[PDB]
Amino acid sequence: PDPVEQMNEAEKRKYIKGKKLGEGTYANVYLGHSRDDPNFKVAIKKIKVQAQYKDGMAPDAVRELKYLRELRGHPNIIGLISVFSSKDQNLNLVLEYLPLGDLEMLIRDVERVRYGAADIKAWMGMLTRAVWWCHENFILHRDIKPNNLLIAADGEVKLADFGLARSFADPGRRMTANVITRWYRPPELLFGARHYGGAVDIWSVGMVFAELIIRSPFLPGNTEMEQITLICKHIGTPTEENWPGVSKLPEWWDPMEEPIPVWGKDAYMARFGAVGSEGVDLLWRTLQLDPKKRITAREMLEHRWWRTDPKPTRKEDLPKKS
Amino acid sequence: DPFGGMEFVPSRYRVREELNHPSLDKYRIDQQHITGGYSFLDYISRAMFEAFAGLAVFIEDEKEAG
Amino acid sequence: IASEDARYRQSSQYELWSFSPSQLASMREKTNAAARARITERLLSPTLPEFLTPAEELLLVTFYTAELLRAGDHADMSDEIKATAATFFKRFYITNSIMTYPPQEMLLVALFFGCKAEGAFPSISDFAKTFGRERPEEILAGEFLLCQGIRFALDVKHPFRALRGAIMELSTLPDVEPARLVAAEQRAREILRFSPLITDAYFHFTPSQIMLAALSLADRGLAERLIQDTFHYSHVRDKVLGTIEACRDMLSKELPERREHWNNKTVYKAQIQPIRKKLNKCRDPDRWNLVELQRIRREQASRKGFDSDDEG
Ligand SMILES: Nc1ncnc2c1ncn2[C@@H]1O[C@H](COP(=O)(O)OP(=O)(O)OP(O)(O)=S)[C@@H](O)[C@H]1O
Ligand SMILES: [Cl-]
Ligand SMILES: [Mg+2]
C-alpha cells in the first residue's frame, strides 16, 4: 500500500520477463522486453542476496547502482535502462541486451573464431573509449578483463562489471590495493600502493591488448609473488632508477634475482608484431612500470595506431561467436 | 573525431598549469603519492569542473517549464 | 548551452532530486496526506488521533538532519559522507512520511548507506558499536528500504571540491591577497558543512551555485569577482547572479551557528517534544517497527500459504 511500492511495481510492469539466460553467484539474468515495444529487448539482472555477507547490501551492488547510472550515455558502457525493487525485496537492474557474449569467449575459441589486426584495432578502440569515458567522469574501473567486455547485437563492445569501481580519491584519501584480477593488476597495486590514479586501469587495458594479440593471458600468475616475478621477467625489473620510491611501497617485494632491464619497444615486436610497429608502440606505452610514465586514456585515443592502415573493422563486420 | 563525438571541452573555464593549492604541497612531496601514481592534474580538473558544472542551470525555471 | 551544464543536467541529481519550490511543497503535502489517509484507513479496521502537519514533518526532518550531522561529526566521518547521509535522509523523507518510518532509526540507516555510497563499506557490527547500538540488525532492516526511498540515485554531488577549485581559480589573480582568500575559504567551507544540508539548497540549486553562494556569504567581493571574470571573458550573467543571491539568502537563514539552536535542550523541550508525542500517538502501527516489517516480508517471500504459526 506504500506509494513508492506501487511506483516500483508500475516500473516493474514496464518490462515483461522471459527466459532465464544465466544463473550466477552474484545475480540471475532473465530475458525481457518492453511492454510498449515488445521488439525492444532488455536484460533483467535480479541481484540475489549473498548469505556470506552479513554487512547488508553487497559493495558490488552499490557500486554498480551508483556508477552505471553515472556513466550511462556512452556507446561503450553497458546501459542501465532502469532500476526497480521486486515484490520479494530484491534489487533488479534493467540493462542493455548484449546477446553476443563477451570478448574472453571470442579470444579462447581459437579453433573456430578467426580475427585479425583490424578486428583487434576496433576492439581496442572500443575498450579505450570506454575507459576514457570512465576516467573523464572520475571513475576507476579496477577490474578490466576480457570476460567483462560484453558484445552487443551490432558488435559494439560494452564495459560491464562495475562491482569494483571507485571515484577518484582526493589527496591523502587511501584506496584499497586489492583490486583488479591478479593477471591484470598493475605493479603499483601488487606493491600495495594506496594512492594511485587512472594508470591502474590503463595497465589492465594493456594486459587485455596483449591477450588479444597472443590469444592467451600474458602474465597468468597464481600468486602475487608469481605475478611480480612475471612482470620482472617479461616487462622489466622495477628499480629506483626507472621508478623512484618503488622500494618504499607498502608491500614492495622483489625475488632477489639478477635484475632484468626494462624491455624496449623492439623487444615486443617479436611476439606482438601482429599489430605492427605503431601498434606495438601503444602496447609499450600502456605497460610502463612507473604509473607516472604510463600513457593516459586521452593520450591513448590520440595515438598514431588508430589512423595507421589497415583501418579498424566496421562493427557490423566483426567476428561473432559460433 | 577520435573521441566519438563525446569529447568534453569546458566552456566557461580552462585548466591551466598555474592552478595549484597550498594544501596540495604536503602531498605532492609525499613519497607514496608520487611513487604510487596519484594524479594531481585529475584532481584539479575535477575540482574545476565541479566548481563550474551547472553554473547556468536554473532549477526552478527549467523544472517549471517542463 | 555550456557543455558542463549539459553534463550536469544528465546527472541523476538533476533529473530526480531537483525541483521548484512549489513542486517540492506539493510533493511533501501529498506525501503527508497519503500517509494520513493510509493510517486512517488501516485504523478503522473509533477515535482517530491528531496527525502531523506538513510543517511539523519538515521541522522534525530538519531537527533529525542536524542530529545526523552531529552524529557524523562524532564518528569523524568525511564531509562527503556526512553530506551524502543527510541528502539520503532528506530524499527519503520527501518521498516518505515521518509518520510512516521512524526517523530516529533512518538517521543511522542513512549514515550507513552514505558510507557505502561514498566507497566505505564498514562492518555493520563496528558501526553499531561506534554508535552504541546493541542490535546491528536494527540498522540493516532499513537499508534496502532507504534505497527504495531515494529512488536508487546514489551519485550525489557536493560543493566542497568545487569550493577548493574556485579558490584555486581566484588564486591566479594578482590583486587578491592570500590571507583574505584563506579566511574566505575557511568560512565558506564551514558554511557548506551545515547551511546547504539543513535547508533545501540541494533541491533548487547546483553544486556550483551553492558553492558560489557559500563564498558570497564568506566574502561577497571574491565571488562577484569570480563571476565577473568568467562572464567578461549578458542576461545569463544577471540570471546567475540572481540565483546565487537567492541561494545566499536561503543559506543565511540557517548559518553554522544555528547548530547550537538545533542541539539546545530548551528548544528541544519547547518545539520538538510536543511533535514527537503527537507522532508517537499518530504513527503507522504496521510499518514503524523496521525489524518486524523485514521479518514479515521475508516470511511472505518464502512462505506463501504454508503457515503453521497463525492462530487467527
Ligand atoms: N545484457 C546482458 N548483461 C549481462 N548478462 C547477460 C546479458 N545478456 C545475456 N546475459 C547472460 O547473463 C549471464 C551472465 O550473467 P552475470 O550476471 O554477468 O553473471 P556472471 O558474471 O557470469 O557470474 P559471476 O558472478 O561473474 S561467477 C550469461 O550467461 C549471459 O548469457
Ligand atoms: Cl586467428
Ligand atoms: Mg561478470
XYZ file of C-alpha atoms and ligand atoms in Angstrom:
733
model
C 0.000 0.000 0.000
C 3.030 2.305 0.037
C 3.184 4.895 -2.782
C 6.841 4.110 -3.505
C 5.998 0.396 -3.551
C 3.254 0.816 -6.154
C 5.545 3.101 -8.160
C 8.177 0.344 -8.139
C 5.525 -2.150 -9.244
C 4.491 0.180 -12.074
C 8.127 0.370 -13.178
C 8.429 -3.425 -12.930
C 5.328 -3.889 -15.108
C 7.004 -1.823 -17.851
C 9.078 -4.883 -18.828
C 7.842 -8.442 -19.366
C 10.245 -11.092 -18.068
C 11.059 -14.139 -20.179
C 13.593 -16.936 -20.374
C 16.319 -17.247 -17.739
C 19.563 -16.600 -19.611
C 22.040 -17.251 -16.795
C 22.451 -18.346 -13.182
C 25.342 -16.624 -11.425
C 26.573 -16.435 -7.845
C 26.123 -12.645 -7.946
C 22.752 -12.357 -9.725
C 20.295 -14.112 -12.044
C 19.707 -12.742 -15.553
C 16.401 -13.030 -17.408
C 15.444 -12.056 -20.930
C 12.794 -9.362 -21.114
C 11.080 -6.938 -23.428
C 9.361 -3.578 -23.121
C 5.598 -3.617 -22.636
C 5.144 -0.684 -25.036
C 7.548 -2.168 -27.620
C 7.964 -5.960 -27.469
C 10.613 -5.627 -30.195
C 12.790 -3.679 -27.731
C 14.653 -6.398 -25.830
C 16.355 -6.000 -22.454
C 18.221 -7.958 -19.781
C 16.792 -8.052 -16.252
C 19.527 -8.778 -13.699
C 17.933 -9.698 -10.354
C 20.650 -9.415 -7.706
C 20.373 -12.368 -5.327
C 21.270 -11.847 -1.679
C 24.680 -13.229 -0.722
C 24.296 -15.171 2.527
C 28.067 -14.940 3.058
C 27.912 -11.141 3.560
C 26.491 -10.003 6.908
C 27.007 -6.244 6.377
C 23.843 -5.573 4.382
C 23.888 -4.693 0.692
C 26.941 -6.018 -1.126
C 29.577 -3.482 -2.243
C 29.384 -4.597 -5.873
C 25.623 -3.977 -5.876
C 26.003 -0.434 -4.518
C 28.923 0.305 -6.844
C 27.014 -0.799 -9.936
C 23.848 1.031 -8.856
C 25.863 4.241 -8.494
C 28.328 4.204 -11.368
C 26.252 2.538 -14.100
C 23.895 5.479 -13.606
C 26.773 7.962 -13.545
C 28.302 6.687 -16.804
C 25.145 5.873 -18.784
C 25.023 7.607 -22.162
C 28.228 6.308 -23.761
C 28.041 3.688 -26.534
C 30.825 1.580 -24.969
C 29.434 1.331 -21.410
C 26.599 -1.074 -20.635
C 23.409 0.947 -20.397
C 21.464 0.930 -17.138
C 17.977 1.302 -18.588
C 16.095 1.139 -15.283
C 16.240 0.046 -11.638
C 13.425 -1.321 -9.502
C 12.702 -3.372 -6.393
C 10.820 -6.644 -6.751
C 7.984 -7.804 -4.508
C 10.433 -10.083 -2.662
C 12.556 -7.096 -1.534
C 15.299 -7.709 -4.102
C 17.148 -5.393 -6.474
C 16.565 -5.513 -10.237
C 18.609 -3.794 -12.955
C 17.076 -3.430 -16.422
C 20.109 -3.247 -18.723
C 21.029 -3.267 -22.396
C 20.622 -6.605 -24.183
C 24.030 -7.987 -25.231
C 23.456 -11.488 -26.650
C 26.849 -11.996 -28.355
C 28.650 -12.976 -25.138
C 31.945 -11.363 -24.137
C 35.439 -10.923 -25.546
C 37.031 -13.695 -23.471
C 34.986 -16.420 -25.174
C 35.947 -14.991 -28.571
C 39.634 -14.987 -27.619
C 39.557 -18.509 -26.175
C 37.622 -20.117 -29.065
C 40.801 -20.440 -31.104
C 39.517 -23.439 -33.066
C 36.524 -21.677 -34.634
C 36.836 -17.879 -34.180
C 39.204 -16.056 -36.558
C 40.109 -12.381 -36.184
C 42.919 -10.200 -37.473
C 44.712 -6.914 -36.856
C 41.819 -4.662 -37.907
C 39.491 -6.531 -35.547
C 41.902 -6.137 -32.629
C 42.164 -2.452 -33.543
C 38.382 -1.992 -33.477
C 38.022 -3.874 -30.186
C 40.852 -1.904 -28.573
C 39.256 1.303 -29.817
C 36.000 0.351 -28.114
C 37.758 -0.576 -24.863
C 39.913 2.559 -24.842
C 36.884 4.766 -25.483
C 35.025 3.079 -22.622
C 37.925 3.605 -20.211
C 38.367 7.186 -21.425
C 34.701 7.874 -20.700
C 35.149 6.288 -17.267
C 38.129 8.479 -16.355
C 36.564 11.585 -17.924
C 33.872 11.207 -15.242
C 36.430 10.471 -12.495
C 35.706 6.767 -12.064
C 38.209 3.917 -11.799
C 37.034 0.522 -13.032
C 39.737 -1.591 -11.337
C 38.547 -4.864 -12.873
C 39.109 -4.616 -16.624
C 39.452 -8.017 -18.286
C 38.130 -9.910 -21.326
C 35.099 -11.540 -19.696
C 33.924 -8.084 -18.547
C 33.682 -6.792 -22.139
C 30.244 -7.756 -23.412
C 29.295 -7.619 -27.094
C 26.028 -6.099 -28.314
C 23.917 -7.333 -31.221
C 25.603 -4.950 -33.675
C 29.105 -5.804 -32.417
C 29.686 -2.793 -30.162
C 31.681 -3.764 -27.068
C 30.498 -2.500 -23.684
C 32.424 -2.452 -20.419
C 30.177 -4.201 -17.913
C 31.358 -5.349 -14.471
C 31.497 -2.281 -12.206
C 31.476 -4.148 -8.881
C 34.988 -2.856 -8.111
C 34.729 0.721 -9.402
C 35.548 3.748 -7.271
C 35.528 7.503 -7.654
C 38.830 9.346 -7.953
C 40.099 9.713 -4.390
C 41.199 13.072 -3.032
C 44.806 13.647 -1.915
C 45.535 11.737 1.270
C 42.452 9.531 0.869
C 43.743 5.962 0.910
C 42.387 3.388 -1.539
C 42.432 -0.396 -1.500
C 45.402 -2.201 -3.028
C 43.299 -5.360 -3.556
C 41.554 -4.657 -6.858
C 41.808 -5.830 -10.462
C 42.192 -9.540 -11.188
C 45.730 -10.740 -10.493
C 46.616 -11.336 -14.148
C 45.697 -7.708 -14.950
C 46.884 -5.892 -11.814
C 49.491 -3.140 -12.298
C 52.806 -3.312 -10.427
C 51.940 -0.465 -8.048
C 48.863 -2.336 -6.792
C 50.829 -5.550 -6.266
C 53.172 -3.421 -4.138
C 50.203 -2.289 -2.034
C 50.003 1.276 -3.352
C 47.233 3.207 -1.599
C 47.320 6.494 -3.581
C 47.113 5.677 -7.295
C 45.268 7.014 -10.321
C 43.786 6.148 -13.697
C 47.030 4.473 -14.768
C 45.967 1.349 -12.859
C 43.203 0.890 -15.430
C 45.456 1.556 -18.432
C 47.698 -1.318 -17.338
C 44.742 -3.710 -17.403
C 43.883 -2.390 -20.868
C 47.432 -3.183 -21.942
C 47.073 -6.670 -20.490
C 43.859 -7.007 -22.485
C 45.671 -5.685 -25.559
C 48.443 -8.254 -25.169
C 45.906 -11.013 -24.561
C 44.140 -10.082 -27.795
C 47.391 -10.429 -29.746
C 48.536 -13.810 -28.390
C 45.003 -15.067 -27.602
C 46.175 -16.194 -24.154
C 46.759 -14.447 -20.808
C 50.031 -12.532 -20.903
C 51.041 -12.902 -17.224
C 48.876 -15.617 -15.582
C 50.387 -15.825 -12.113
C 48.834 -17.989 -9.414
C 50.215 -15.897 -6.532
C 51.114 -12.254 -6.029
C 54.798 -13.197 -5.974
C 54.329 -15.108 -9.229
C 52.730 -12.016 -10.757
C 55.613 -9.802 -9.611
C 58.167 -12.291 -10.948
C 56.379 -12.479 -14.301
C 56.274 -8.684 -14.579
C 60.000 -8.537 -13.815
C 60.658 -11.284 -16.365
C 58.601 -10.137 -19.354
C 58.364 -6.353 -18.776
C 61.348 -5.434 -16.603
C 62.542 -5.416 -13.014
C 61.405 -2.217 -11.249
C 64.260 -0.276 -9.672
C 64.870 3.124 -8.114
C 66.252 4.231 -11.492
C 63.106 3.692 -13.585
C 60.614 4.047 -10.695
C 61.702 6.396 -7.895
C 60.475 5.234 -4.499
C 59.197 1.826 -5.627
C 61.077 0.081 -2.810
C 59.047 2.128 -0.290
C 55.620 0.857 -1.366
C 53.638 -0.732 1.491
C 54.091 -4.255 0.086
C 57.104 -3.949 -2.207
C 58.713 -7.314 -2.926
C 61.434 -8.471 -5.299
C 62.504 -12.078 -5.998
C 66.137 -11.037 -5.348
C 67.489 -12.403 -8.629
C 69.645 -10.687 -11.228
C 67.602 -7.635 -12.314
C 66.158 -7.670 -15.832
C 66.488 -4.436 -17.858
C 63.178 -2.941 -18.956
C 62.407 -4.211 -22.449
C 62.051 -1.562 -25.137
C 59.531 -1.354 -27.949
C 61.603 -3.538 -30.280
C 61.732 -6.373 -27.742
C 57.949 -6.743 -28.031
C 57.938 -6.733 -31.839
C 58.938 -10.410 -31.890
C 55.813 -11.563 -30.020
C 53.194 -8.860 -30.689
C 54.287 -7.664 -34.144
C 50.913 -8.923 -35.333
C 49.644 -5.402 -34.575
C 52.542 -3.710 -36.381
C 55.260 -1.433 -35.056
C 52.948 1.509 -34.377
C 50.509 -0.805 -32.618
C 53.274 -2.321 -30.501
C 54.282 1.222 -29.556
C 50.864 1.739 -27.974
C 51.213 -1.589 -26.166
C 54.561 -0.498 -24.753
C 53.172 2.853 -23.614
C 50.416 1.066 -21.695
C 52.888 -1.264 -19.932
C 55.203 1.225 -18.219
C 56.341 0.121 -14.765
C 56.173 3.628 -13.319
C 52.478 4.637 -13.496
C 53.639 8.249 -13.809
C 55.092 7.433 -17.255
C 52.110 5.249 -18.205
C 50.027 6.543 -21.104
C 46.620 8.018 -20.285
C 43.301 7.181 -21.917
C 43.136 10.547 -23.687
C 46.725 10.201 -24.893
C 45.781 6.672 -25.951
C 42.842 7.753 -28.108
C 45.225 10.223 -29.791
C 47.826 7.567 -30.620
C 49.034 7.110 -34.182
C 47.982 3.434 -34.339
C 44.283 4.195 -34.844
C 44.820 6.098 -38.103
C 47.511 3.720 -39.390
C 46.434 1.216 -42.014
C 44.730 -1.096 -42.039
C 41.663 0.770 -40.784
C 39.651 -0.847 -37.969
C 36.867 -3.224 -38.918
C 33.330 -1.870 -39.011
C 31.389 -3.131 -36.006
C 28.879 -4.768 -38.356
C 31.714 -6.897 -39.799
C 33.342 -8.003 -36.530
C 33.745 -11.732 -35.810
C 30.853 -13.349 -33.964
C 30.919 -16.433 -31.778
C 29.908 -19.669 -33.486
C 36.884 12.624 -34.379
C 38.850 10.292 -32.090
C 36.526 10.690 -29.082
C 33.441 9.501 -30.979
C 31.828 12.925 -30.703
C 31.845 12.709 -26.897
C 34.868 14.916 -26.175
C 34.288 17.166 -23.164
C 35.558 20.714 -23.726
C 34.665 23.153 -20.917
C 33.019 26.414 -21.945
C 33.448 28.875 -19.056
C 36.761 27.655 -17.606
C 40.133 26.262 -18.641
C 42.542 24.069 -16.680
C 45.948 25.766 -16.871
C 49.321 24.922 -15.365
C 49.306 27.783 -12.840
C 46.393 26.260 -10.896
C 47.519 24.947 -7.505
C 46.532 24.964 -3.834
C 48.921 25.101 -0.854
C 47.183 22.161 0.829
C 48.391 20.049 -2.113
C 52.054 20.881 -1.435
C 52.288 18.470 1.507
C 51.050 15.559 -0.629
C 52.882 16.375 -3.877
C 56.097 15.639 -1.954
C 54.670 12.581 -0.186
C 56.622 9.510 -1.267
C 53.502 7.349 -1.570
C 51.597 9.826 -3.754
C 54.386 10.362 -6.291
C 55.697 6.790 -6.410
C 52.151 5.359 -6.448
C 50.933 7.324 -9.456
C 48.379 9.685 -7.919
C 47.257 12.305 -10.453
C 47.025 15.828 -9.057
C 46.101 17.036 -12.544
C 42.998 14.844 -12.417
C 42.059 16.267 -9.009
C 42.494 19.849 -10.237
C 40.355 19.108 -13.296
C 37.648 17.502 -11.151
C 37.618 20.485 -8.781
C 37.309 23.000 -11.622
C 34.582 21.001 -13.368
C 32.539 20.713 -10.177
C 33.027 24.426 -9.490
C 31.672 25.387 -12.925
C 29.400 22.435 -13.790
C 25.809 23.651 -13.887
C 26.569 27.324 -13.276
C 23.738 28.386 -15.618
C 21.382 25.528 -14.658
C 18.329 27.354 -13.279
C 16.479 24.557 -11.499
C 13.246 26.397 -10.700
C 12.559 27.812 -14.172
C 13.762 24.771 -16.129
C 11.702 22.384 -13.991
C 8.540 24.505 -14.067
C 8.903 24.810 -17.854
C 8.685 21.014 -18.185
C 24.484 25.943 -23.833
C 27.656 25.171 -21.897
C 28.914 21.595 -22.080
C 29.394 21.338 -18.313
C 25.801 22.485 -17.793
C 24.573 19.697 -20.080
C 26.724 17.063 -18.376
C 25.263 18.195 -15.045
C 21.705 18.097 -16.403
C 22.430 14.477 -17.354
C 23.059 13.546 -13.704
C 20.565 11.669 -11.560
C 20.550 14.532 -9.058
C 19.095 16.931 -11.633
C 16.536 14.603 -13.231
C 15.316 13.022 -9.962
C 16.012 15.315 -6.980
C 15.876 18.849 -8.415
C 12.525 20.664 -8.435
C 10.956 24.083 -7.998
C 9.868 25.203 -4.515
C 6.211 24.740 -5.482
C 6.789 21.191 -6.742
C 8.665 20.252 -3.561
C 5.952 21.747 -1.343
C 3.207 19.927 -3.252
C 5.126 16.644 -3.058
C 5.620 16.940 0.702
C 1.965 17.863 1.236
C 0.753 14.950 -0.899
C 3.078 12.512 0.881
C 1.791 13.663 4.274
C -1.802 13.393 3.034
C -1.247 9.882 1.671
C 0.308 8.772 4.959
C -2.632 10.219 6.895
C -5.147 8.537 4.585
C -3.445 5.138 4.753
C -3.127 5.201 8.545
C -6.755 6.317 8.886
C -7.998 3.545 6.588
C -5.924 0.984 8.499
C -7.040 2.132 11.955
C -10.776 1.734 11.311
C -10.335 -1.974 10.503
C -13.220 4.767 16.556
C -11.427 7.943 17.693
C -8.649 8.888 15.272
C -5.520 10.679 16.533
C -4.173 14.080 15.537
C -1.817 13.639 12.576
C 1.286 15.728 11.942
C 1.141 18.832 9.775
C 3.484 19.134 6.772
C 5.171 21.981 8.653
C 5.704 19.714 11.662
C 7.079 17.000 9.370
C 9.546 19.485 7.876
C 10.573 20.728 11.327
C 11.287 17.195 12.546
C 13.145 16.422 9.313
C 15.393 19.444 9.847
C 15.996 18.570 13.508
C 16.965 14.988 12.724
C 19.139 16.161 9.822
C 21.046 18.364 12.269
C 21.291 15.415 14.662
C 22.578 13.195 11.845
C 25.261 15.781 11.090
C 26.237 15.942 14.768
C 26.488 12.143 14.811
C 28.660 12.174 11.698
C 30.945 14.705 13.363
C 31.093 12.388 16.387
C 32.144 9.499 14.116
C 34.919 11.576 12.485
C 33.394 10.923 9.056
C 34.412 12.703 5.867
C 32.458 15.762 4.747
C 31.307 13.966 1.597
C 29.926 11.041 3.606
C 28.074 13.297 6.056
C 26.583 15.295 3.180
C 25.539 12.106 1.374
C 23.873 10.740 4.511
C 21.974 13.983 5.095
C 20.882 14.075 1.448
C 19.687 10.462 1.608
C 17.728 11.346 4.751
C 16.062 14.387 3.179
C 15.207 12.480 -0.002
C 13.787 9.500 1.878
C 11.575 11.795 3.951
C 10.498 13.769 0.908
C 9.323 10.530 -0.769
C 8.183 9.027 2.563
C 6.317 10.490 5.526
C 7.671 10.896 9.054
C 4.500 9.157 10.270
C 5.424 6.016 8.291
C 9.021 5.180 9.265
C 10.911 6.229 12.416
C 13.446 8.994 11.731
C 15.416 8.079 14.863
C 16.429 4.859 13.063
C 16.511 6.161 9.489
C 19.162 8.641 10.651
C 21.643 5.827 11.320
C 20.391 3.962 8.248
C 21.212 6.985 6.086
C 24.642 7.385 7.679
C 25.429 3.720 6.958
C 24.174 3.792 3.378
C 26.040 7.055 2.795
C 29.245 5.400 3.944
C 28.529 2.675 1.398
C 27.662 5.245 -1.291
C 30.992 7.040 -0.773
C 33.106 3.891 -1.170
C 33.400 2.990 2.533
C 31.924 -0.401 3.371
C 32.428 -0.952 7.111
C 31.224 -3.878 9.179
C 27.703 -3.293 10.478
C 28.844 -4.506 13.906
C 31.618 -1.904 14.135
C 29.141 0.757 13.003
C 26.584 -0.154 15.669
C 29.408 -0.250 18.220
C 30.622 3.240 17.329
C 27.013 4.429 17.659
C 26.272 2.456 20.839
C 23.653 0.315 19.093
C 23.275 -3.142 20.631
C 21.359 -4.842 17.798
C 23.047 -4.189 14.426
C 20.099 -5.683 12.522
C 18.039 -2.667 13.636
C 20.089 -0.757 11.059
C 20.111 -3.340 8.260
C 16.313 -3.571 8.489
C 16.140 -0.105 6.952
C 18.955 -0.262 4.413
C 17.115 -1.607 1.368
C 14.071 0.439 2.382
C 16.121 3.636 2.255
C 17.451 2.509 -1.129
C 13.895 2.459 -2.453
C 13.126 5.835 -0.905
C 15.896 7.744 -2.684
C 14.779 6.123 -5.958
C 18.123 4.317 -6.333
C 20.111 7.526 -7.002
C 23.427 7.027 -5.191
C 25.620 9.572 -7.035
C 25.316 12.797 -5.020
C 27.354 15.881 -5.925
C 28.728 18.205 -3.240
C 30.302 21.690 -3.496
C 33.372 21.218 -1.251
C 35.761 20.314 -4.067
C 34.059 22.983 -6.175
C 34.901 25.467 -3.413
C 38.562 24.448 -3.461
C 38.625 24.737 -7.252
C 37.082 28.208 -7.159
C 39.645 29.259 -4.545
C 42.390 27.974 -6.846
C 40.913 29.940 -9.754
C 40.897 33.079 -7.599
C 44.488 32.415 -6.503
C 45.636 33.137 -10.068
C 44.515 36.761 -9.760
C 47.438 39.015 -8.725
C 45.298 41.661 -6.994
C 43.732 39.291 -4.445
C 45.577 38.763 -1.164
C 46.357 35.246 0.101
C 45.224 35.819 3.703
C 41.829 37.132 2.584
C 41.427 34.094 0.324
C 42.342 31.719 3.161
C 39.817 33.311 5.514
C 37.135 33.260 2.807
C 37.789 29.592 2.018
C 37.669 28.598 5.684
C 34.377 30.410 6.261
C 32.782 29.150 3.037
C 33.778 25.577 3.897
C 32.356 25.936 7.408
C 29.145 27.146 5.747
C 28.997 24.259 3.265
C 29.244 21.792 6.167
C 25.849 22.852 7.565
C 23.796 25.502 5.767
C 23.058 23.720 2.438
C 22.360 20.461 4.312
C 19.802 21.842 6.789
C 17.961 23.864 4.111
C 16.524 22.871 0.727
C 19.652 24.084 -1.091
C 20.315 20.798 -2.896
C 16.766 20.770 -4.286
C 16.786 24.175 -6.025
C 20.454 24.937 -6.761
C 23.500 23.401 -8.476
C 26.671 22.451 -6.565
C 28.431 25.320 -8.340
C 25.596 27.675 -7.389
C 25.647 26.520 -3.759
C 29.441 26.886 -3.635
C 29.231 30.409 -5.062
C 26.534 31.236 -2.504
C 28.684 29.979 0.376
C 31.603 32.028 -0.954
C 29.439 35.140 -1.314
C 28.467 34.585 2.320
C 32.157 34.317 3.241
C 33.342 37.245 1.081
C 30.912 38.641 -1.496
C 33.763 40.518 -3.166
C 35.635 37.381 -4.211
C 32.535 35.585 -5.514
C 31.397 38.616 -7.501
C 34.945 38.946 -8.845
C 34.967 35.314 -9.989
C 31.592 35.669 -11.722
C 32.694 38.932 -13.355
C 35.887 37.278 -14.598
C 34.004 34.296 -16.023
C 31.395 36.401 -17.836
C 33.639 39.253 -19.009
C 35.723 36.730 -20.967
C 24.671 39.296 -20.762
C 21.287 38.110 -19.500
C 22.883 34.853 -18.338
C 25.164 36.816 -16.004
C 22.219 38.578 -14.357
C 20.246 35.339 -14.039
C 23.240 33.586 -12.461
C 23.692 36.461 -10.011
C 20.009 36.326 -9.076
C 20.099 32.579 -8.481
C 23.279 32.989 -6.424
C 21.586 35.669 -4.313
C 18.502 33.512 -3.716
C 20.726 30.613 -2.651
C 22.710 33.010 -0.455
C 19.553 34.072 1.383
C 18.287 30.504 1.761
C 21.657 29.637 3.310
C 21.865 32.744 5.509
C 18.566 31.740 7.088
C 20.432 28.767 8.668
C 24.107 29.599 9.242
C 26.502 27.247 11.062
C 25.947 28.991 14.404
C 22.358 27.693 14.305
C 23.936 24.332 15.153
C 23.644 25.359 18.803
C 19.960 26.086 18.142
C 19.267 22.519 16.976
C 21.173 20.968 19.913
C 19.608 23.240 22.553
C 17.717 21.440 25.318
C 15.215 24.276 25.771
C 14.461 24.464 22.042
C 14.048 20.680 22.086
C 11.622 20.677 25.023
C 9.623 23.614 23.633
C 9.449 22.960 19.870
C 10.430 19.298 19.364
C 8.952 17.215 22.187
C 5.247 18.020 21.551
C 5.714 17.000 17.913
C 7.328 13.722 18.968
C 4.447 12.938 21.343
C 1.895 13.691 18.620
C 3.861 11.380 16.321
C 4.074 8.664 18.988
C 0.278 8.721 19.112
C -0.365 9.059 15.347
C 2.336 6.811 13.870
C 1.754 3.943 11.461
C 1.154 0.786 13.537
C 2.419 -1.772 10.996
C 5.370 -0.020 9.322
C 7.050 1.623 12.334
C 8.930 -1.482 13.532
C 11.515 -1.976 10.795
C 12.749 -5.318 12.161
C 9.229 -6.775 12.173
C 8.440 -5.322 8.746
C 11.568 -7.032 7.415
C 10.686 -10.320 9.139
C 7.150 -10.397 7.756
C 8.360 -9.517 4.259
C 10.882 -12.370 4.416
C 8.180 -14.790 5.558
C 5.855 -13.576 2.796
C 8.610 -14.068 0.215
C 9.400 -17.600 1.429
C 6.156 -18.892 2.985
C 3.218 -18.305 0.635
C 0.381 -20.235 2.276
C 2.157 -22.991 4.213
C 1.885 -21.219 7.575
C 1.955 -23.112 10.880
C 2.155 -20.250 13.418
C -1.037 -18.343 12.539
C -3.831 -18.790 15.083
C -6.418 -16.380 13.649
N 22.997 -7.715 -21.359
C 23.436 -8.689 -20.536
N 24.139 -8.400 -19.419
C 24.587 -9.359 -18.587
N 24.369 -10.672 -18.804
C 23.677 -11.109 -19.889
C 23.160 -10.109 -20.836
N 22.522 -10.782 -21.808
C 22.614 -12.106 -21.515
N 23.310 -12.303 -20.377
C 23.586 -13.631 -19.766
O 23.955 -13.482 -18.382
C 24.943 -14.446 -17.970
C 25.996 -13.791 -17.074
O 25.338 -13.063 -16.025
P 26.149 -12.188 -14.934
O 25.140 -11.527 -14.027
O 27.191 -11.315 -15.590
O 26.858 -13.368 -14.089
P 28.406 -13.771 -14.281
O 29.237 -12.514 -14.152
O 28.549 -14.655 -15.495
O 28.634 -14.645 -12.948
P 29.846 -14.400 -11.920
O 29.174 -13.706 -10.634
O 30.857 -13.490 -12.503
S 30.748 -16.195 -11.387
C 25.418 -15.108 -19.273
O 25.004 -16.472 -19.244
C 24.728 -14.391 -20.435
O 24.197 -15.325 -21.369
Cl 43.435 -16.017 -35.621
Mg 30.971 -10.988 -14.706
